[PDB]
Amino acid sequence: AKQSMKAREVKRVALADKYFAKRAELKAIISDVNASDEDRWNAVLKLQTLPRDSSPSRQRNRCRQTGRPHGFLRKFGLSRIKVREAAMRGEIPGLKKASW
Amino acid sequence: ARIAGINIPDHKHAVIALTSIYGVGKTRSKAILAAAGIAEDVKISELSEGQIDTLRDEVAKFVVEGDLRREISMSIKRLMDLGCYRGLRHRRGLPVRGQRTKTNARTRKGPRKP
Amino acid sequence: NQYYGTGRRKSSAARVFIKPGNGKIVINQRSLEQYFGRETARMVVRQPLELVDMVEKLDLYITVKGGGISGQAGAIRHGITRALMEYDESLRSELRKAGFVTRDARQVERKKVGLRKARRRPQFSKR
Amino acid sequence: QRIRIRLKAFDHRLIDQATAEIVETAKRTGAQVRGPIPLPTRKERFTVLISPHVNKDARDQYEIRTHLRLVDIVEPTEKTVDALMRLDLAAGVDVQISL
Amino acid sequence: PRRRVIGQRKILPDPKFGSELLAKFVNILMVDGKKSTAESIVYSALETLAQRSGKSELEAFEVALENVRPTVEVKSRRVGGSTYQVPVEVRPVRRNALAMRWIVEAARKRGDKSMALRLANELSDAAENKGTAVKKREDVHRMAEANKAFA
Amino acid sequence: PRSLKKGPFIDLHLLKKVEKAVESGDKKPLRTWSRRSTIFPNMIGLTIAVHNGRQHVPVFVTDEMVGHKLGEFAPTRTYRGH
Amino acid sequence: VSMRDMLKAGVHFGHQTRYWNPKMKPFIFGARNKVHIINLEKTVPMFNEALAELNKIASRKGKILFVGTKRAASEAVKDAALSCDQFFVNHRWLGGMLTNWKTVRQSIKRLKDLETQSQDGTFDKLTKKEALMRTRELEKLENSLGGIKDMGGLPDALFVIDADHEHIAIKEANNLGIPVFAIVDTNSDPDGVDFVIPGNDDAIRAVTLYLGAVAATVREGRSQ
Amino acid sequence: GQKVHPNGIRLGIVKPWNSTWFANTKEFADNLDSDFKVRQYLTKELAKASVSRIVIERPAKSIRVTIHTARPGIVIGKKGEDVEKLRKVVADIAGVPAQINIAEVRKPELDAKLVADSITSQLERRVMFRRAMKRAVQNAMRLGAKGIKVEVSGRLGGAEIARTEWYREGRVPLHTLRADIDYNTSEAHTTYGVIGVKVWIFKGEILGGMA
RNA sequence: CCGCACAAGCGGUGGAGCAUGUGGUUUAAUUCGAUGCAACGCGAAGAACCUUACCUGGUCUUGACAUCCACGGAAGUUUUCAGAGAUGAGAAUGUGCCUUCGGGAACCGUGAGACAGGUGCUGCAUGGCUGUCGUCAGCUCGUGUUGUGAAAUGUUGGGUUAAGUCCCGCAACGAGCGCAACCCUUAUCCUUUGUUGCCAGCGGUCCGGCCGGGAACUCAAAGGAGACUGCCAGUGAUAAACUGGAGGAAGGUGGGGAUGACGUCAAGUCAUCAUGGCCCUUACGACCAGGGCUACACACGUGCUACAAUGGCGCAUACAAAGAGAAGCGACCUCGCGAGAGCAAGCGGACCUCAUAAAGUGCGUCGUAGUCCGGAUUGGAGUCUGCAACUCGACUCCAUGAAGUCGGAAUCGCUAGUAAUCGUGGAUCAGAAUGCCACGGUGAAUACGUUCCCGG
Ligand SMILES: [Mg+2]
Ligand SMILES: [Mg+2]
Ligand SMILES: [Mg+2]
Ligand SMILES: [Mg+2]
Ligand SMILES: [Mg+2]
Ligand SMILES: [Mg+2]
Ligand SMILES: [Mg+2]
Ligand SMILES: [Mg+2]
Ligand SMILES: [Zn+2]
């Protein structure tokens, strides 16, 4: 769709990227059983200081081929229309219309 | 019967007579019975006071009947009085647990209107 | 000697073994009345042998897998008949005419798209 | 001492040519094979709306069937393993060699 | 059935009793294939029939049928512009079905606390030309003769 | 109920504003977009405007509200019937 | 054929006096028992003069089409054509068989292709039901065009039995200029037959006489 | 109504895929999208290379592409320098040691793609579509096809409404699975807009799979 | 002449509650589109943020993203200050690499515009695609002949058929798109291969196919071979065809899918995409926070769950299928009333895990009532997910205990493994399934018929 949306998703991804390590350790700490209760406290506080788009939740599985958000084939990440087209000309190897 | 819960439940299987008490549910009924140690299907009839007192005590431990109703009424009164969202909805008689305001909410909505 | 079989059904399959001289029936290391919680199952598994009238002449070692108790018992009766056949081959005709070499293939159908079931159609309010 | 090789494919013809090549290279070095023993091949169904706007009823069903072969050789010589090392295959064939 | 006439798949004799009308019976009373619970309901009731009616409960089945079995039916269509209540006679299998339905619903409507008790109460009634099954048979054997004006 | 192993949740800059209230006391009713942060015993007897989505309504904080969240007092869907 | 040879076979026999055609009066001896009697005095010389033309055509490498669709006489006419290495129509005559020659040629090609394919193979590649269906289609084509698969082109001469029954064939022939030799019963219209033989067309004996004499003279014309 | 795509339905039956590589769920979407990009690049650059088939397999590690076309030495240009820098750009877009291969088809008339593409070219040459498809179908059939069907769609002749047309020739049965029917879709971009074209050729029935 | 067309059945709908859609109504906004068939648990296979196009506010203007030209800087990293953030001001850190040392790439910023940008409008400008008639049996052509010719013939008639299915009569015949069939799938058997699959025979075994062993059987999955009214009689133009039987795992296109001749509907969609015209461009562009997309006088649809003793409850116990999985399934252990938590095996999986089928059955209990029915609804306290569960997530425990005691007219759906029930999984997904695509368990009733309805 709108190129703004596409680039925006790219940015969300790259941003979730370079904070992965800190997010991991902070999840650990705040989840750490028997944390200092302050180390855990100021930990979760500092976590709410990271850029929001470092979470995976802000992301949205987006069609690689089109940028259609809905009908996301998490196996191919394509629009529900595109995966059928790949079957129609025989792009996905070995694929065929099933009949069982 | 003339148990701590003023109500005189059915002279039937203990728990059936117990959950009958307001504020006493199946859990409360069986847990109170566990302390007595009497059978699940013992009727109120054929049971002496020597245990009725005991169960009256075991339910005196918990807050039940009118006292529980007053606590539930308070847990909602002040809630409304704080003007909290669910309190305003309780004032408007609305489902405060986030349900479809559009249709088939007649439970708290009440009767049917055109 | 030994006489085997393979009775199939909607979702069960049962190996079958005839060792003559008896009528006991070991099934998945169980006894029939102990194997099943349903009696008519035992009845319908007796049916073929009851017709051939040879109860305590051959014991059975059998093994059924998959599917539901009825499909089980059906596969059982089938493999029974198959063993009866490969033990007689004169009574192949006897059970064919008895209608026990049927190999029933009655099976569920795939749930087709747009159908609340495999065949049931949605409650389309025509009006 | 065993050498196992899984093969995952999409058509059983190609995988059959591949297994033929495998067992023949095996018997060149006189390897000791346990046979193809085809394994449960996997079937992947997929139904997607074929209509861009407002048509839940219209759907098309596809499926991927990864055919599945396994070879085992209990006495790999060097002249066995060199073959799989110097092995010649197609593209859509998938190999998985292991002890 | 515009070209061929199909009906119901051929029943099989109950292995537990050897008879067959019991099989069609339990199937009419059967729901979703609740076979076990349904044969337990009918066997338990024929047993106490074999006592409350003396022996011949399997024959008391027919003692109920012939007392309640319908002889006439009505089937109206738009052959010329409107309907008419026409009495007509049918082959025995259809009246088998009707009488079985009559004693299947006779038991259910009464309720009698439990299914086994309700079924047992009606089997006797139908066996002895009283009650509701033979009564709804009287309905069809009564309204039919009054509307024998034409066909 | 979010959880108990994590304790309540309140914003960084909201804590800044509340500690400004601490050092200052009764002041200009602070404002936030974050109706999600948790009330704390510090912010008592004061008020704060928070965005209804278009405008920030001032809620005067009291004790019993502590521990609750802000969005339970800042409506965003209005209604006058039909 | 001599008048005595015909008469014993019954060539003089004809249809009822109720059912005759007007142009046949010259060829009719008279009537007996309300039955038309054909005159052999005309029949014999005309048949001989037609045999002369048939011998001539066959002696210049002519292709001859024997035509008759009677259910009784179909095999007789087929065998008659086989006895002189010629082509025949013994089943229902298709409309425009001669005029729509191109369609028949496509049908002839298809019949040849099916028989060649069965000999070559690929029936095993076909499903057994398909192979059986292909055999049935080949049999149907052989039943329809058994006689004219090897005709190659339009014939040089036509021999017709009961010209009234086969009137479409003679109309086609006249439209093509192909000569018509025909056994013409009293009920037929003789305009379409350039060498007309008036005689019985139903009786098996006289039909076989016609066919045998024609085939003997055709083999004679071929031999040279 | 909305008919079945013919090449999709005959795939494997008689039709091979345009990609073969075996992969796994992890290395699949990435894989196929890389393949998309390389295909598309080739399409745009090979607008003149008369590309008919662009198949791409990813062997175990390497990947090879194969192009069936009709500009063989032209696709090669001179010494493959063109296709050589192509090998470079495909290795770089695919991150794989590239393996370019080409094998022309001598019967461009006898595909469904190249013919429709010529048709669209002449469509932007503003030729009359009807005469164009006539030309094409006769060339192909005369050459030895067993049947051709063509179709074009959209405001034909600069129309103010989308007049369609379909034309048949020879024999094209689209319910006999043993048959081979090459099919293709293409487009032309008029000043008035876009016009679809679809092309089928039935070329006799195959016996024994791809073999 | 036809179709679950009616009929005959079977279970519903319409009553209840709840879910779920739509339209109202409201909003600052409740984004757009879908609108009898052929909209309406629609597009969405899954809106807390994101999504979001929408409101409000916050801001930007060659720009979020594209290319080109300079000017500069390695690229980077990490942290502070302010902001609600978007963002502004920084401070540190690195300052490289290929070099023909001149430059260049990666990229970063500034300028400059040449430009970008649009989910702006226009499905009556279109492409592409899909719904429908309808898998209804038709639709046509060549050639022929018929007439001077509009045309006709076939395509007709008599039979017969799932069928323009077939045959015969026959100025028609012959082909083509169809129909059929070749596909997949399923039912019998045979060959091959037998580990992670099998355990018949064997011994051992703590009894666990476990362990030697076994290759049989079961499966596995490649080959196959099969069903043709082939048989027989009954018919019947002796014709097709049909009746019935035999044989047979299977019989009369075995079972099921895939496959939609034409065309029809300016059917639907420019918000998948593509695209003609216009269309704003400091904004109809862009960026951020919050909101809304979840409102409710309502209406209308679609569903779920109930109204009970074939039931409820407790205890005991049997039988499935199909799947999925490595920022994954995750057992095991322990704890926790549970939701869970910790611990951590195993497994990219015929190997580990999910994953421990429900209905069933056995036993006891209830004994018919707004009930031990029903469970909504509110209370309390959690659980878990993610920055974040007010607006609005899922989920446990405690407590409550609405209506409902079978639902007018009207009406739906269904021909066998079907209905109807009982569970299972999958897609999408941090999380969020009564839906949907799937799977097995159980397994019915009814067809006199075509006179009727509907449609062809
Ligand atoms: Mg765009
Ligand atoms: Mg998400
Ligand atoms: Mg719009
Ligand atoms: Mg079809
Ligand atoms: Mg018609
Ligand atoms: Mg926002
Ligand atoms: Mg919505
Ligand atoms: Mg209960
Ligand atoms: Zn005559």
- Those residues with Cβ within 8 angstroms of residue H109's Cβ, 6 or more apart along the chain or in another chain: H115, H136, H139, H140, H143
Instruction: Give residues 83-112 of chain C lying near strand I (Cβ < 7 A).
Output: 92-93, 96-97, 101-112
* DSSP, res B88: H
Report strand pairing: G157-161 vs G64-67.
Answer: parallel
Question: Touching check for H15 and chain A: CB below 8 Å?
Answer: yes
| Alpha carbon of B93 to ligand 8 centroid (Å) | 30
3-state SS string over D12-72?
A: HHHHHHHHHHHHHHHHHCCCCECCCCCCCCEEEEEEEECCCCCCCCCEEEEEEEEEEEEEE
What is chain E's Cα-based Rg?
17
Q: How far apart are CA H92 and CA H177, in angstroms?
A: 41
What is chain H's Cα-based Rg?
19
- Those residues with Cβ within 8 angstroms of residue G23's Cβ, 6 or more apart along the chain or in another chain: G189, G190, G191
CB H41 within 8 A of CB H89: yes
Q: Which residue has the tokens 């109120």?
A: B44
Instruction: Give residues 188-207 of chain H lying near strand I (Cβ < 7 A).
Output: 189, 191-198, 202
Q: Do chains C and E touch (3 or more CB pairs under 8 A)?
A: yes
User: Of E60, E85, E90, which Cα lies nearest the Cα of E74?
Assistant: E85
CB H185 within 8 A of CB H116: yes
CB G60 within 8 A of CB G186: no
Sheet holding G64-67, edge to edge: G87-89, G64-67, G157-161, G180-184, G195-198
User: Of H63, H43, H12, which Cα lies nearest the Cα of A90?
Assistant: H12
Q: How far is CA A57 from its chain centroid?
A: 7
Report strand pairing: C30-31 vs G195-198.
Answer: unpaired
Instruction: Using CB atoms within 10 Å of the CB of residue C98, give its burial: 0 to 12 exposed, 13 to 18 middle, 19+ buried.
Output: middle
Q: How far apart are CA G90 and CA G68, in angstroms?
A: 5
User: Of E15, E20, E34, which Cα lies nearest the Cα of E100?
Assistant: E20
For the stretch E106-115, contacts whose Cβ atoms lie closer than 8 Å and that sit 24 or more positions apart, written own/partner, are E106/E131, E106/E132, E106/E133, E107/E29, E115/E41
Token pair of H171, please? 């024999």
Closest chain E residue to the Cα of C47, Cα to Cα: E15
Q: Which amino acid is at H9?
A: I
Q: In E53-146, which ranges are continuous DSSP H helix? A: 57-68, 92-110, 115-127, 133-146
Q: For chain I, which bases have at least one atom within 7 A of a protein Cβ?
A: 1-13, 16-30, 33-34, 38-52, 55-57, 64-65, 77-78, 82-86, 116-120, 125-134, 142-146, 162, 167-189, 193-196, 199-201, 217-223, 226-228, 247-250, 254-264, 266, 268-269, 271-277, 285-303, 309-311, 317-321, 323-327, 341-342, 349-350, 357-362, 365-368, 372, 376-394, 397-402, 410-421, 427-430, 436-453
Q: Which residue has the tokens 């008036």?
A: G198
Neighbouring CB atoms inside 10 A of F3's CB total: 10
A96 within some domain? no
Nucleic strand I under 7 Å from the C-beta of B45? no
Q: Which amino acid is at A34?
A: N
User: Of H122, H182, H176, H187, which Cα lies nearest the Cα of H152?
Assistant: H187
- Those residues with Cβ within 8 angstroms of residue E31's Cβ, 6 or more apart along the chain or in another chain: E38
For the stretch G219-224, contacts whose Cβ atoms lie closer than 8 Å and that sit 24 or more positions apart, written own/partner, are G219/G83, G219/G84, G220/G55, G221/G54, G221/G55, G221/G56, G221/G57, G221/G58, G221/G59, G221/G62, G222/G58, G222/G59, G222/G84, G222/G85, G224/G59
For testing contact with chain H, the best of D94, D95, D96 (most H CBs within 10 A): D94
Instruction: Give residues 19-38 of chain F lying near strand I (Cβ < 7 A).
Output: 31-36
CB D10 within 8 A of CB A93: yes
Q: Which residue has the tokens 């059959």?
A: D16
- Binding residue ranges of B: 19, 21, 24
Which residues lie across from H182 on neighbouring strands? Answer: H201
| CA distances from residue G147 to G68, G75, G114, G144, H40 in whole angstroms, order as listed | 12, 11, 16, 8, 61
What is chain D's Cα-based Rg?
19
Residues A11/A17/A18/A20 CA torsion (nearest 10 deg): 140
Nucleic strand I under 7 Å from the C-beta of C6? yes
| CA distances from residue B99 to F52, F76, F80 in whole angstroms, order as listed | 21, 17, 20
CB C80 within 8 A of CB C49: yes
- The ligand whose atoms approach the alpha carbon of F33 most closely is 6
Q: Which CATH architecture has domain E20-147?
A: Orthogonal Bundle (1.10)
Q: What is the residue-wise DSSP string for chain G?
A: --HHHHHHHTTT---BTTS--GGGGGGEEEEETTEEEE-HHHHHHHHHHHHHHHHHHHHTT--EEEE---TTTHHHHHHHHHTTT-EEE-SPPPTTTTTTHHHHHHHHHHHHHHHHHHHH--TTTS-HHHHHHHHHHHHHHHHHHTTTTT--S--SEEEEESTTTTHHHHHHHHHHT--EEEEE-TTS-GGG-SEEEES-SS-HHHHHHHHHHHHHHHHHHHH-
- Those residues with Cβ within 8 angstroms of residue F33's Cβ, 6 or more apart along the chain or in another chain: F50, F51, F56
Q: What is the residue-wise DSSP string for F12-67?
A: HHHHHHHHHHHHH-S-S-EEES-TTSBP-TTS-S-EEEEESSSSEEEEE--TTTTT
Token pair of C75, please? 């596969």
Q: How far is CA H167 from its chain centroid?
A: 20
User: Of G91, G101, G95, which Cα lies nearest the Cα of G141?
Assistant: G91
Diameter over CA atoms, chain F: 48
Q: How far apart are CA A2 and CA A13, in angstroms?
A: 17
Compute the C-alpha angle G110/G111/G115, nearest 5°: 115
Resolution (A): 4.9
Q: Which amino acid is at F18?
A: V
| Alpha carbon of A79 to ligand 3 centroid (Å) | 21
CA distance F6 to chain B (A): 24
- The helix (run of H) or strand (run of E) holding residue H34 is helix H29-45
CB E148 within 8 A of CB E87: yes
Q: How far apart are CA H19 and CA H35, in angstroms?
A: 9
Q: Which residue has the tokens 């701590």?
A: B4
Q: Which residue has the tokens 């209608």?
A: C99
Helices E92-110 and E21-29, interaxial angle, to 10°?
Answer: 40
Q: Which residue has the tokens 């799989």?
A: D84
| Alpha carbon of H159 to ligand 3 centroid (Å) | 27
Neighbours of chain B (3+ CB pairs under 8 A): F
| CA distances from residue E145 to E90, E138, E140, H74 in whole angstroms, order as listed | 16, 11, 9, 99
Closest chain G residue to the Cα of H209, Cα to Cα: G125
CB D4 within 8 A of CB D77: no
Query: Domain D2-99, what fold?
Result: Alpha-Beta Plaits (3.30.70)
CATH number of G132's domain = 1.10.287.610
Dihedral sign for Cα atoms in the order F61, F64, F69, F72: negative
Neighbouring CB atoms inside 10 A of C112's CB total: 11
CB B19 within 8 A of CB B26: yes
Neighbouring CB atoms inside 10 A of H165's CB total: 12
Token pair of D21, please? 């090549």
Token pair of H59, please? 């062997």
CB F31 within 8 A of CB F48: yes
Neighbouring CB atoms inside 10 A of B113's CB total: 6
Neighbouring CB atoms inside 10 A of E105's CB total: 16
User: Of F64, F9, F6, which Cα lies nearest the Cα of F35?
Assistant: F9
Q: Which residue is nearest to nucleotide I197 (CA to C1')?
A: D39
Q: How far is CA A21 from its chain centroid?
A: 16
User: Of E13, H4, G82, H42, which Cα lies nearest the Cα of D58?
Assistant: H4
Give strand letter and number of the nucleotide nearest E78 (CA to C1'): I452
CB H128 within 8 A of CB H120: no
Which residues lie across from H183 on neighbouring strands? Answer: H200
CB B88 within 8 A of CB B98: no
Q: Which amino acid is at C115?
A: L
Query: Domain B2-65, what fold?
Result: Helicase, Ruva Protein; domain 3 (1.10.8)
**Method used to solve the structure:** cryo-EM
Residues from chain E that touch C40, judged by Cβ atoms under 8 A, are 14-16, 35-36, 39
Give strand letter and number of the nucleotide nearest A3 (CA to C1'): I65
CB E39 within 8 A of CB E26: yes
For testing contact with chain C, the best of E11, E16, E17, E32 (most C CBs within 10 A): E16
Q: How far apart are CA H75 and CA H87, in angstroms?
A: 12
Q: How far apart are CA G194 and CA G182, in angstroms?
A: 9
Nucleic strand I under 7 Å from the C-beta of G175? yes
Token pair of C77, please? 């009766």
Q: How far apart are CA D76 and CA D82, in angstroms?
A: 10
User: Of F80, F81, F73, which Cα lies nearest the Cα of B80?
Assistant: F73
Dihedral sign for Cα atoms in the order A15, A19, A20, A26: negative
Question: Which of A30, A37, A48 lies closest to F12 in CB terms?
Answer: A48
Q: Which residues surround ligand 9, an ion (CB under 5 A)?
A: G 162, 185, 201
Structural domains counted in chain F? 1
Question: Touching check for D92 and chain H: CB below 8 Å?
Answer: yes
Nucleic strand I under 7 Å from the C-beta of E44? no
Diameter over CA atoms, chain H: 54
* DSSP, res B4: S
Token pair of A40, please? 């855990």
CB A92 within 8 A of CB A86: yes
CB A79 within 8 A of CB H48: no
Question: Which of D10, D11, D49 lies closest to A80 in CB terms?
Answer: D49
For testing contact with chain A, the best of H7, H14, H26, H36 (most A CBs within 10 A): H36
Q: How far is CA B107 from its chain centroid?
A: 19
- The ligand whose atoms approach the alpha carbon of B16 most closely is 8
Which residues lie across from H68 on neighbouring strands? Answer: H53
Question: At E51, is the secondary structure helix, strand, or coil?
Answer: helix
Token pair of A13, please? 């991804």
